[PDB]
Design an enzyme around this catalytic site. Structure first.
Site, PDB file in Angstrom:
ATOM      1  CB  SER A  47      -0.877   0.045   1.258  1.00 16.73           C
ATOM      2  OG  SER A  47      -1.740  -1.126   1.333  1.00 16.73           O
ATOM      3  CB  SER A  95      -3.938   0.916   3.736  1.00 20.39           C
ATOM      4  OG  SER A  95      -2.833   1.636   4.219  1.00 20.39           O
ATOM      5  CB  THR A 186       2.162   1.750   6.680  1.00 22.52           C
ATOM      6  OG1 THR A 186       0.756   1.947   6.516  1.00 22.52           O
ATOM      7  CG2 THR A 186       2.631   2.412   7.986  1.00 22.52           C
ATOM      8  CG  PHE A 188       1.452  -6.056   6.046  1.00 29.44           C
ATOM      9  CD1 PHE A 188       2.556  -6.859   6.173  1.00 29.44           C
ATOM     10  CD2 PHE A 188       0.241  -6.506   6.525  1.00 29.44           C
ATOM     11  CE1 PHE A 188       2.471  -8.133   6.719  1.00 29.44           C
ATOM     12  CE2 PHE A 188       0.132  -7.787   7.112  1.00 29.44           C
ATOM     13  CZ  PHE A 188       1.256  -8.604   7.202  1.00 29.44           C
ATOM     14  NE  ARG A 230       3.208  -0.882   9.232  1.00 31.95           N
ATOM     15  CZ  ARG A 230       2.089  -1.176   8.587  1.00 31.95           C
ATOM     16  NH1 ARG A 230       2.156  -1.800   7.423  1.00 31.95           N
ATOM     17  NH2 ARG A 230       0.902  -0.827   9.105  1.00 31.95           N
TER      18      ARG A 230
HETATM   19  C1  LIG Z   1      -1.321  -2.135   2.359  1.00 35.43           C
HETATM   20  O1  LIG Z   1      -0.018  -2.745   2.164  1.00 35.43           O
HETATM   21  C2  LIG Z   1      -1.768  -1.726   3.797  1.00 35.43           C
HETATM   22  C3  LIG Z   1      -0.744  -2.208   4.825  1.00 35.43           C
HETATM   23  C4  LIG Z   1      -0.077  -0.984   5.335  1.00 35.43           C
HETATM   24  O2  LIG Z   1       1.132  -0.895   5.228  1.00 35.43           O
HETATM   25  O3  LIG Z   1      -0.823  -0.166   5.817  1.00 35.43           O
HETATM   26  C5  LIG Z   1      -1.461  -2.743   6.050  1.00 35.43           C
HETATM   27  O4  LIG Z   1      -1.961  -1.560   6.732  1.00 35.43           O
HETATM   28  C6  LIG Z   1      -1.680  -1.676   8.135  1.00 35.43           C
HETATM   29  S1  LIG Z   1      -2.701  -3.764   5.233  1.00 35.43           S
HETATM   30  C7  LIG Z   1      -2.962  -2.714   3.734  1.00 35.43           C
HETATM   31  C8  LIG Z   1      -2.261  -3.311   2.512  1.00 35.43           C
HETATM   32 CL1  LIG Z   1      -1.595  -4.883   3.099  1.00 35.43          CL
HETATM   33 CL2  LIG Z   1      -3.104  -3.507   1.002  1.00 35.43          CL
END
Ligand SMILES: *[C@@]1(=O)[C]2[C](C([O])=O)[C](O[C])S[C]2C1(Cl)Cl
Lengths: 245, 246
Positions: A47, A95, A186, A188, A230
């Site tokens: 994201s 996100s 962020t 993930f 992170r």
């Molecule tokens: C995106 O990578 C968001 C991650 C992020 O880094 O915020 C998580 O949010 C805590 S889940 C969502 C996704 Cl995995 Cl699509």
């Protein structure tokens, strides 16, 4: 351009974390990192991809303007926090994956490819499906490339209008004080497997007095309980640099 | 068509203050205030004037761009916090009067007058000194006029580039959470006496989830220790209205 700072590994080894932090004062022409190799290794953006995806959605008119509301259809989503109407800022901040999946679909593979070329965005490989290339597809970008991208955005130097850059910039503010402003995002990708772990990120920049610091962090993650690192690892590093703040 | 909500008055009397709060959900077509008469009374804007002054500084090119730095020349200033180079946002956030007095001089009376007319800013009276009309001159603006101006800014509808309006908005962010964002500015003309009080302001808007609320507060100030009421009285009203808190 880039110099190793091995004191910063303490934070990683403390936690048995394989990761990298890249931190640049004033510009990408002077970065430091705990891990020279990993600094230009490329990973799914997950994201953090909402930054260029949002810019592209505005540039293409897929997103009407800064005030567009993305309404929830009342149908189930993977996260409870995504089950409601969201502003552009709100959808970035929580996100909300499915909002941006539909933005990517309306942008279209031709336009998405065009923009990622203009943006010099990682390996620029959007295969894997138009609505999942940055989540589980072939797209990869390094922490150095993130810091280069974010710096252009900070200076309004991406190939998009200055208004759309400023709009996405306000959407990224996560911490505001009279003399300290943080923009950040962020990411993930998931926990993958122990053999092929997921990736987590935190990227952004800090304005303190009249200085700016760009940062990009990523780490391998096979356990969701490790997710906060992170932010906490980069936060402790920046605190020890006096930046945080 | 503004409505009066007298139940808000107990937040002022509880603190022995005279003042007004104007709060509009969604737009300036839906405003409520504790005091219909004081809501339209016009007061010196003090540092709240840094909002239009910044936009005008950008429009005229006095302020070069969003990353302009305002360098401290080393000569003393009322506040240590001002004795340093400042970005546009830092100068607004710490309310550094001298940086904005200099912007105002460079803008000059003709252009300043012209933008205040485009913005429908208060009585638009900048006479008596180009670098202090908003601090101790004749400029006056009401809480209702502050909310109408701020809504225009929020909508990018002022007569200024969208880009300069966006620059100034980011410089006004004071609170940020994933579904709650506040843009605001304080002002304080000085502590007066009971019979001839100063004015303190807090103006701005709150984006909560997908709603927006524009607000403007002012109060008479005749005791320095009461200054923090300019935030806690409107905060308490926004709590009781359910904007602050779940
Ligand atoms: C995106 O990578 C968001 C991650 C992020 O880094 O915020 C998580 O949010 C805590 S889940 C969502 C996704 Cl995995 Cl699509």
């Amino acid at each position: 351009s880039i110099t190793e700072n091995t004191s910063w590994n303490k934070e990683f080894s403390a936690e048995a974390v394989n990761g990298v932090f890249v931190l640049c004062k004033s510009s990408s022409k002077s970065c430091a990192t705990n891990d020279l190799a990993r600094a230009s290794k490329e990973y799914l953006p997950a994201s953090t991809f909402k930054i260029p995806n949002a810019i592209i959605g505005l540039e293409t008119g897929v997103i009407k303007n800064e005030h567009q509301v993305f309404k929830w259809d009342g149908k189930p989503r993977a996260m409870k926090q995504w089950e409601r109407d969201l502003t552009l800022r709100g959808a970035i901040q929580v996100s909300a994956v499915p909002v941006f999946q539909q933005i990517a679909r309306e942008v279209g593979e031709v336009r998405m490819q065009k923009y990622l070329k203009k943006f010099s965005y990682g390996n620029q490989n959007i295969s894997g499906g138009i609505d999942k290339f940055w989540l589980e597809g072939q797209l990869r970008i390094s922490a150095v490339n993130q810091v280069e991208f974010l710096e252009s955005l900070y200076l309004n130097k991406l190939s998009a209008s200055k208004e759309n850059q400023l709009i996405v910039k306000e959407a990224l503010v996560t911490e505001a004080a009279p003399e300290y402003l943080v923009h950040s995002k962020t990411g993930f990708s998931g926990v993958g497997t122990e053999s092929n772990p997921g990736v987590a990120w935190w990227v952004g920049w800090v304005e303190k007095e009249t200085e700016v610091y760009f940062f990009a962090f990523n780490m391998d993650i096979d356990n969701e309980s490790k997710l906060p690192l992170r932010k906490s690892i980069p936060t402790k590093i920046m605190e020890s640099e006096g930046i945080i703040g």
